[model samples]
Target chain A: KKGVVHGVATVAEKTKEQVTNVGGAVVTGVTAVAQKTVEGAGSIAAATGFVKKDQ
Target chain B: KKGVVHGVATVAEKTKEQVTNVGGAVVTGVTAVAQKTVEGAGSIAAATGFVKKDQ
Candidate 1:
């Protein structure tokens, strides 16, 4: 879980830099990272306590 | 419309992170994302105004 958080944060920082370079607003990059974090977190939450049924 | 925007934004963020990990400058990451965004936007605009003619 902690690894996930760090990974997400690193991604967010990278994205922010990217947006700034391409003439995009910093906020745009921020928003994207935020959205992805939320989405990824949601997925992790949903998958918790669920076991995959292997064939 | 919003979903498209969000998807594009997400892609931009991911690309930036990838560039950073590969030892690319922040500006380079930014430029790539920005370029991709513009291209994606253009494609979306064109696709909206006309139907694709399948081969």
Candidate 2:
């Protein structure tokens, strides 16, 4: 399913950005983004055929 | 819509982290987030009985 690929890719891209940029004190923000990222990525990606926590 | 505020806030949070800490020459990620961020913000804030783009 293309949804599967896109789902995975959306997460990949999101996570990549999460790590790709950071300095010292920004560590906290990065961590927050990282923790929320998987769920957040899905929220951004909106690809179907997957489970939703809020559902 | 609380979803509207959350919708606004989700992207705001996402976009905030996108730059809240960016270094020079690491310009690549910044712009991507800037552009996709709004749609991403909406995707995240899908409230009930509201419109949906993917729908």
Candidate 3:
């Protein structure tokens, strides 16, 4: 769960940093899984599965 | 068959969703599509063709 949060945060931060270096700004956006499954333990498991398998 | 196996899955998903939302995703990978052809027959015709004589 937290790792999922961290992973998403890392992705956003890295993207923002890179864009900033290129003269762009990071804009906040909606965050959603789009789809979800309960056949997993927790948020991290479900989120990772969705991000990896679908995203 | 299998709708071109989901029409290249990720591409199809992104293509479908982008066409749903504002417009696109920054695709971060490369894939290869060689070529396939059939001798002519089935449901949609076992068809074959080149890229089309440069228009």
Candidate 4:
């Protein structure tokens, strides 16, 4: 029984870290996408004269 | 086993939307920060005579 409980605890700890890793990776991807979206918008605004770009 | 499955399902349903909510909020913040960063950089460049700003 003690061995079983120890095994379950180990699995739970690994599962927690796995979930945290997945969540962190997904959020990082979201941040990258959001950054690129703004960069593209800024480029278009500059090209269209809504915003000026440094020459 | 049935009770465990039901509990897992309930927790999973809640976790799904909770993660989604967190990712969306984080991305929104990243977008806002990125937008402000470019705007601030442009303002500084314009002030320093590196870029022109419309009067």
Candidate 5:
């Protein structure tokens, strides 16, 4: 995952270079990514049903 | 960007379904993503050089 982390960072960095006037958009996008991250991590059981944890 | 955000979430969710034994990996993945996000948003100028803010 460290590799993925570094890789995506590079991707994001490069993405910013090619495009302009999208800073605000990225803020919004990051918010979106964060929300999904919470759900993905919190509900690993509900998401996969491998192990059900009461919520 | 909201669309991309939701889209990536779905992608992550589906990705989790297809694979198991990777929750820990995803935690790491999300951390990686978050770190890049901070750098991307905070350094909009350095990344693109559109605007240089003293660091």
Candidate 6:
């Protein structure tokens, strides 16, 4: 009984950690794409006499 | 769009599998404890002449 409970708790926490890491990995993928897209466009617009990247 | 959406879905399914694994571990703990407790009580009763082990 003790072993079973302890093992379950260990799995639960480990799963939670994995889930967190998974979330971060996916979220960064989304953010990274969007960020680069914006940066690319911002740079192009700056070169085209439009709004600056910092603006 | 492609990478972001795909990344989210990959995380979602992988996270689901981890959660399912965690649930199975916890449920097994509950089941094991109940089964062991019942068997332990039955054995003790048999020794006390309250109920035979075979019965």
Candidate 1 lDDT score at position A22: 33
lDDT of each: 0.23, 0.26, 0.21, 0.23, 0.20, 0.19
Q: lDDT tens digits, residues A1-55, model 2?
A: 1122211011222332432333322222211121223334345442211223332
Tens-digit per-residue lDDT, B1-55, candidate 1: 1222211133333343432221111222111111111222112311111222324
* DockQ scores of all models, one per candidate: 0.05, 0.07, 0.02, 0.07, 0.03, 0.01
Give the residue spans of candidate 6 off by over 4 A: A1-15, A19-55, B4-9, B13-32, B36-55
Off by over 4 Å in 4: A1-24, A28-55, B1-16, B20-30, B34-55
TM-score of chain B of each: 0.16, 0.13, 0.20, 0.14, 0.13, 0.14
Q: Can you tell me which runs of candidate 5 are displaced by over 4 Å?
A: A1-17, A27-55, B1-55
If you assessed candidate 2 against the hidden native complex, which CAPRI class would it receive?
incorrect
How high is each candidate's TM-score? 0.14, 0.14, 0.17, 0.18, 0.11, 0.14
Clashing pairs in 6: none
In terms of lDDT, the best-performing candidate is 2
Candidate with best DockQ: 4
Clash count per candidate: 2, 0, 0, 0, 0, 0
Per-residue CA lDDT of model 3 for A1-55, tens digit only, reads: 1122211111221121211111112222333333222222222321111112222
**Candidate 6's residue-wise lDDT over A1-55, tens digit each?**
1122222121322233332221111111111111111222112211100111221
Model 4 C-alpha lDDT versus the unseen true structure: 0.23
**Sliding window of 10 residues with minimal summed lDDT for model 5 chain B:** B22-31
- lDDT digits (tens) for residues B1-55 of candidate 5: 2222311121232122221221112111111122221222222211111222233
In the range A1-55, model 4's lDDT, one tens digit per residue, is 1122211111222122212211222333222212322233223321111223345
